[model samples]
Target: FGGRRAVPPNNSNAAEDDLPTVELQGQEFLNVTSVHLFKERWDTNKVDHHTDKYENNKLIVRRGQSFYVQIDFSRPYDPRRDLFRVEYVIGRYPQENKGTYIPVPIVSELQSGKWGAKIVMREDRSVRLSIQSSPKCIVGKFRMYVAVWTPYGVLRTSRNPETDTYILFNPWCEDDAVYLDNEKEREEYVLNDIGVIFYGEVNDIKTRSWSYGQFEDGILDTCLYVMDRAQMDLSGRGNPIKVSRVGSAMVNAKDDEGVLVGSWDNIYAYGVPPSAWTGSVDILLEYRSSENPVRYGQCWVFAGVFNTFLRCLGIPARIVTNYFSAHDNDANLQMDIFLEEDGNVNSKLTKDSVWNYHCWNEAWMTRPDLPVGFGGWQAVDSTPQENSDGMYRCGPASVQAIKHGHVCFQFDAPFVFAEVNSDLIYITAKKDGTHVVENVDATHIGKLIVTKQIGGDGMMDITDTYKFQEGQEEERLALETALMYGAKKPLNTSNVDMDFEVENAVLGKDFKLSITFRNNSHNRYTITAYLSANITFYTGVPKAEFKKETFDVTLEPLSFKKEAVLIQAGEYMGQLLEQASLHFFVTARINETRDVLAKQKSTVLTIPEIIIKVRGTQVVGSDMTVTVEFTNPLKETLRNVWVHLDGPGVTRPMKKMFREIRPNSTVQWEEVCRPWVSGHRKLIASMSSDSLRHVYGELDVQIQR
Candidate 1:
């Protein structure tokens, strides 16, 4: 109450200090909505310094109500030096979202004598006011007050002469008299009212002695007072209803601290009568204790009380912790809680010195019908404003930031072990790196399987069998594995503490295994994980076989520390080997083991099983004869063998044929192409076995064409 306003004495004949009268009349109206005032002081070390007071003293006006509020300053006024004026505003609550306050149009210039102002409301239900003061006298030390007369009564208010007390007089009250209860009710009721009215006068007087040091020290001692009109109205009278065991149980002190709830020891014995506390708890937990430790204590108490009340009302409430800023130079260890409304929860925290990372709590209210509003905790120290020097502001000045962890997953390349057959092999393409096996014929050897013998140390074996189709294209299999889908996490290693290891436990550097399959069918098959030893798989897809052999690959790890075996094919295999020679090069990272393995495994294919059989003879006439032949070097009979022949100055019976060669036997057909004129002639013959299309033998002879 020491900081509260009081009424001043009335004396017309005394000194200006003894009596200050501000008149409100003429066509001008005095609009008083929210009044924010600043006091400026001059210092030798700095320019003009100012301190601001954020106060909201509003007057409620109904649809057709009229009101006149006045302010009286007791200080002597100087016409030339002191600038005086009053601003009036009428608006709605939530001033941003359709809530706005417009200034009153009527105004007047103030004279040195006494000043008065008036206000009126028109059909728009809007507020109007007038100010009688000079524009230059806006900054100074002064007293201010407001009075309003509504349709129900004439309410006049003035600032107390001795203190910051306010006086209210309503003439309409008969025996009811504007008592304390009525004042409380009126104040509470007007808290949600339309607008406010304010009036004040300024005076300029220079002191004889100017001491910069004293002024600076005094400025430090001066504390600004800010009144939240909205919260003030909801401050009195607690909820009347109480239910036993309605709230959540109180946890330990840690929880209480985070929730801003007080320790169990601090709860009032008789309990804060249900009427003394509003369910809403507005507690600010300031980590700073020097200014006032009690405020921090109060925050804990408020939290506990609010939580208890909410529990008594059957509302589930809990606390939360987060970064908060409430002061210019300090951050508040603050927490808040809100009752659930319309299926959503809302809470508010006071402005601190910081701007981010704030935390609060929430209350789950079972009663869906109750209107939930935030208004409980009150700031012990008003929000700080920019000091006259503009150096010390009231909100959080610094912000805090945070960072998080990463994870990774690995898999192995798929291998197949199958019995040889005679159908086409198929492998489907990878979708998002997922492999599905489609169809497998005798020709479809599954992925290569590499297994290390149970008792052998570092020894491994690999096996896979695929059918060789007599008249089809040689199937190519993708031997690569993929990285498991969705297995990658943040890669930052700042916090890693463990040794990471990955290994291929099968196939100890011996055999070369590469296989791919395509699924030409409509059904999808689940691919299984590949099992192998001595082979490191880097792909994410464990095993993928599809109907369409759309996916292509070389080999898992692409390089192995094994000796390369020269498995020869026909001349065609030689050509294919030549075309695919790049695959033999190691793409893996070069290291001691890899370099050694590269040298140890390097090999070139030379021996071929099939040989082209061609017979050439020159004719005296323009016709030369050539025989196209196919032969099997081995004792096996070659089925579905093809033959072709070309030459200059020669003639042939046919150009192509599909035939069979007997075991240890040869088949031949005569074919020739004739060039009309030739100095020198050339001959060419080629043959392919259906069983191994990739195997072909070719013969060439120079010819002049």
Candidate 2:
């Protein structure tokens, strides 16, 4: 049966000329033409079909899991009447020569034993075997060697090993999930514990809702698929730590099988799904049930779904948000802003952009797949952007690696490092569409990295969580320098013949910008110029159009002309400046020559103030009152005002809703908060209204024990 052939005269070249032999170690294959595997869902009591059950010949093996493996002998070789013998050997070790054999019965008599594998010889010659999968006999991976041989122990017809691999993971023992109190319960099993899903306006307004695991909606099944298939399409063999990497790589693109997934194809259509979804349960229920993955999503949506997937699979995961997240297209790790003489916004040849805020997942696991010290919380991103290894994927990158500049580690450590730690460069452009660096800021890329706390409704200030200390200047530089893959020398001056200056502007006050371009050429010329201001997301990408203007001018040879423009504040320009924490893009360009003078420049936005007044000392086990005060910056009478208060060590966030406030009227509130754990809690207060928009304030509460 193993490609047997009759040898005529033994011509030495005849054997050599024949096809390479198929090496079935023992003999012929259990005399079977084909085999299949299926699993029975204990919770649902439904048996899955064969082709859909196993991924890469490996299926999920929970502690009390059960499976049915079917084999076709091509024709009925009766176990009772046939002269040949058929049996199965289940072993913990992978090698055929190693490990003791625990033989399973060839008939259905021993059905009560949990670890026994028995043949359910049916009326048909085709044989069906049932197995209760367990790891006590072998804790790692297992293989079932099913073979039929001569009446003696030796196999003459066929024998096959490495037949099929099934993996046994950490014990998922909780029968019915309720409240999980300890670290072991939370880390090992994902049940109905608490998770905060983030949403809302940029910089000022942040909103969170409750989210939990959806075991009711086939969450475990989906997780098994994600874990098993996450990286298999790229590499083969078993992996313990790279699973996180696998998950990250698989989720990079919304092409096929990531989360129902999200997109930015159209910007205005983004906020809908992320706003209503508060839990992963809702996402999965919709995806597996009736919904096709039009899984309307955004950054926070990607991170939330990934968070749930990791937790369900026994990995501790949390979503982290990086405010002012830059999308450095060139991997240079610096955002370049170009500008015109009149402070108008211009365009560039490249699509390098910045997102106002970006969210990603942080999972905790040991890195047997990587070098030492990467075993802690690994950052995994499901929000697909660029491709890794020819596919859209991300993460399982080490946060420790990101902080120390060890980006050379596997899984795009440099990408993550640059996410929270990159520089910003400002430049002046000439008529030739080229630029020179004007000013460079180092603390632009990674700012206000935050996550939800365990027992609080407020933000957990993980700002220092991903960075060296404020005064660790040399150490920070050393870390940045060590990330030589993205390293670039500072650009202090430009090759363009232009001098640019921007005056200081306060949030409630107006400011002026000036640019001088000397016509170093000897020829007289006429050129059309353009300038504009753009209100953008914090990452510096244009979100909404603000103001623009153009001018035509002629100058004598070698004469220099200076253009100036005033940027307004305090309700002018449709209150666009009220998004005070936004980026400013002023571009100047020559129309006739198409000479790109300046395209854009970025500045930390300043806006009208919202004051947070803490009246009492913050002490452990003590109560203190916080007062929030803000004026109606809008022209019309504000309709409604909602205030939200949140901080670490607090049980739940407090909310105060007011009906309305008159124009220029100050709306203020005083609320009492009790501090539990003693530490410096970064308490945040925010107010929002249809007319007034999102206004926010933050204060550091020193909670002493």
Candidate 3:
């Protein structure tokens, strides 16, 4: 038994590989020596959508698509005498009852959309068989084995340890839940690797480039690893509903040891800052390697990484940005802003706040769990704003259901409905510890919802798809329907005699705010207008006040007076937050009319863009140098400066760092990128620092053979 075994004779298999094998007893017994998986041909076919592009040495295929595999034998197979079967197994137990084990018997002919093997060609010592995976089969790493019937007993060949089969979701298959009818959308959502994420206030929208990098090396394993960390049932992987929900939970590091650890405290000494990340590949690969959460992520970062995981698994997904997004706690369906009688916000009384903008992802799928007409784009948020089912995950809730206010549907539809359709209530504290409603802004939240356009970088407005017009009858009906399900009542308008008008503000520059006070009543009034400005986070939490002033003005009946408040560049430069957003409060009281008027203006300053340039010829397998330049527009020096670059087929993720960048000076970062594939590709780069953050740019370069 300890003696050395003789090497098996060569079996002329089309697949080139070296594996240990032994010769069968004779031609009487059929034994499988090798199996040739036509990986390159299968991957190149359009039906599979280029699954082989993912950086994995093993075979990767999509479900519902028939792929060819040749089984070579030590002796010619006789259909009349030799009995053979192919087994596909996944997971530890691989029990057939759990659907982890699938056995395929050789049939005379192949049936459509079923798991079966058919003989396509027969040779002297080999038989090429076409294997089909059921569209509903679980997706994971699968081991394949071949069994043969012999005179003594049934014998089975051991699987090639190196050749594991990976089956992914098929967006192109009609039978799949993740199927998308539009070819353009599937290409953009499933194939495009680089995209832009929108942020900032509704009036001043900003765009930042992000590299999904789903096809990068180790990303497939990382995505699968995330599901494994969650202990997801192998059989449940076939359902897109369960997969998307798990994706939402695993994108944020809350309950499970997921990918990203979210932080809003602005302290990043322990790990990378939320604003410094440029893409998902870096975070996913790092988390997979370390088996721990990455440093930090915000709403957009969470959504970005979640999108990558979904697309990598062949699911159609897109990133969506909602302006004036509300975090409706307590299911009130209203975002309350508590203001003291003295025109200052009462922090203790204000629990619900609105973010200037929030980013979330939408995955396309047919919801068999929900009612009819509830299929298509489903809103899913990975940001840890609230927990669902005792876990920090949200959605897979139907966007159509949210639009129609079907809050009773599965998942967190009520929470998502309030995010876009919630009303803004401004309540002033009274002397008796009670609060009186000062203003009810119905059209404040969900100002604009947008995503990147298909086949282009332009913004696509999907606000109408989420909700009807501001004053539409359908919109009111939707609100009332949601209120029926225990969501708080929707209150319903704005007379701003003290209107605050602002020009587009640029970072590190002086901007003027125009304030106008008008007397609509038929009497002359003496007004004391309290004007204040504060540097607040996107969530409307004030950090520090930089400008405060009181103005006394006399207004004639039916007359208006205009006042200008000049804010110097030095006044609010250092106090600016990550979004460079300023919250201006205008509270006024009329002596004659005894009227209280309050108005708030949320404005964001525009950040400078980084410029990218290519210094060498673009060619595959050659080092091409990329130069990135950015100017520090601030008066203060920027510390902890870093630049990140990533692109599909162009380069792997590369990050360069520096200690500091001088004030008002241009800093250049250069890195050599060796392109692994040829074609037109985009190289996206972003620069982040202690003072300046979230500045990004992209350039498209063509690589020749």
Candidate 4:
């Protein structure tokens, strides 16, 4: 009597009298027991063939693709009678508005490039269903759940980590923005796990193979984790433009505790040396676990890891090198080089210079955000050269716009254009405590732009892709357009003709630089020329002056004078950087006309190579010893000698140090390791010492199974 007198439920909160209701039951009601994810089938499917790296034991699938899953029930399931739904959730707190929660609908037929599910096969107590995910869905690790409406109540399948699916951008799908057409490029940029990064001076460029290892174990998880750390909007993960822009910013640690913390001071006491790094896999994995930025990286390292991330996410990318690259600190489209009266660079006023080389990356995508024909091969630099919108990041700028000097476009286009086509303005500080424009070198900035050849060992000259030929009308027009877009216009104030000729100098040997002076005017003039040579960084900043001279010469009308300056090995042996680069400046003043003739030359001193040899059976899982050999080329004793050997699947990174090495003496070290995987593999070795740096070599070996 008490229960009957409790209370009547309101009509608004009551169930409909005509609607059917079921009693709460256990196994007697329709129930979902388990889910069978066809991971192997989904991985090898045509649409997701590029993402077949399932070594991490996760159900990996690509967007805009179909994957099959079988569900087990307590009783025979009929699609017409059974009321059920499938859903996915990501992140700690999933919400439908944020794209972290997605519920798929049941459809009679599947539509292309859309999300839906349909019954494929029905058995005694199970059913196989095909689920189609849209390319616009959020990309990340997701938990799949199945909920069934039962007579008793709503029954949901228990959560299992094994059933979790990872969704990635689908480059094979035409609807995807990152889709690449050529299979060869897809193989080289997306599938190939290793590549070469170009470095060193323009005239004597070098290459070092890097292990991209985008599909390596845990790399996908690490990449997604990095995205999560970036606080990227879940809805933006499907767009290549947003992903690339974020990727460009996240490769450096200046802002977001990103992947690599860059160091240029040559001090790496607590971190791995930048030159010692062999690949991006180790860097990415270490950062993921530590949740801290890995120490010690430069331009090449930043570009290498950015390439890895883009390729891992199905975006085709490659490493690009710009020799004699310019860093426009003030965004004036000009590199300012200030020199004292003695012709040596004044470090105080010279804030920008043309680097011997700079490395960046280019990703392929269609740019719907820009005007038509601005798509494909976007230039993205992660070296933290300058801030973009208050962040220490560079482009995703359109290469087409950069070539045409359309710096008016979005995403740091001016900075990238300056990197490839900036003018070099030399300013000399006079005795009057004033500065005057000395000369303008238009062709010195973007000397050579290169990238690895597709399916080849050589490099392809991409200079034409970034700019027109130096002295061409189109090039001049491009420069003018850039200046109009906020680049400082340079003044070419040189009044005399002077030529500096320097050959490729070899280490441990003396060299001569020949200077030629011509008087094109009808009047005879007396000239006082100041010449100096300094050990300069690859960025063209003069460190220490090794040689200085002053000469007085009288030239007749329409006459020329030639002089030779000798430089001994002892002057620059200990002042060389890893590239062994040098900078020369000549300031000639006309006594009669008060005209100034300023000229500078950039060159490199070659270093010896390192040799690598393997001694043992070259087979998978076989123990072998690798011998690295290098001869000291310096005249003085090389101190603090360090040698590093590394290769994927062949050996862990190894380093050996020797206290001292005598001049012209050979140093040989051995590394013992066992090969874990078969097929063609590369072994790289490098040597650096207190006296010499940038010694590297690589050997390709065939490992038989």
| Evaluation by lDDT, superior candidate among 3 and 4 | 3
Question: By descending lDDT, how would the candidates be arranged?
Answer: 3, 4, 2, 1
* Ten-residue region with minimum lDDT total, candidate 2: 11-20
The candidate with the higher lDDT, 1 or 4, is 4
Q: Any runs in candidate 1 off by more than 4 Å, and if so which?
A: 1-620, 633-636, 648-653, 656-658, 662-664, 671-675, 694-705
Model 4 error, position 612 (Å): 2.0
**Highest-TM-score candidate:** 3
lDDT of 2 by residue, 1-705 (tens): 335643222211101121112323333323666565553332221222111222223444443344566777756766554433323233211222222233444544434323555675553546676665333222223334444544445332234434433333333323211122455545333433345544322345354444444333366555545543442321121232555665555443357565555544332242233333434555655555543453566666667677666655445667888876765432356766665444343366334666667788887655655678776677776665453453344567777766677666777665666667776666656687777665555655665787777655567777665777534874466465644855444453212245456665545467776766666667555655565555654445565555565666564567777878676674234544223433444334444354544433444444465677787758877788878788876555777566666553532456677788887788788887777645545555556555444355666567887
Tell me the lDDT of model 2 at 559: 75
Pairwise TM-score winner, candidates 3 and 4: 3
**TM-scores, in order shown?**
0.18, 0.52, 0.92, 0.87
- On a 0 to 100 scale, what is the lDDT of residue 184 in model 2? 50
Clashing pairs in 3: none
Local distance difference test, candidate 4: 0.78
TM-score of 4: 0.87
> 1-705, model 4: which lDDT tens digit per residue?
448643332111011122112334564556777788867633444334455543456677778878878889889986667877787877655667656667777778989877788888999999888898887777777877787776666656666779888887777777777788878888887877778988777767778888887766778778887887777766678788898898778888974478898876555677877877778877999998999999878889998888989888778899999988876554666667787775555657866567888899999988998999998899998886654565466778899998988888877887888788877777778778888876678887888999998866689999999999988899889877877876655455423588878877887688998899887777777888888787876667667888878898887777788988888888887667766788887878786766667777778887767899999888888878888998887657889888888776677667799999998888889777797657778887777676577678888878888
For candidate 4, the per-residue lDDT at 134 reads: 85
Backbone clashes, each candidate: 102, 20, 0, 2
| Candidate 1 structure lDDT | 0.23
After best superposition, candidate 1 residue 510: deviation in angstroms? 12
Q: What is the RMSD, in Å, between candidate 3 and the native fold over all Cα?
A: 6.1
Could you tell me which 10 consecutive residues in candidate 4 have the lowest summed lDDT?
Answer: 10-19
Query: Per-residue error at 512 for model 3, in Å?
Result: 0.8
lDDT of each: 0.23, 0.52, 0.79, 0.78
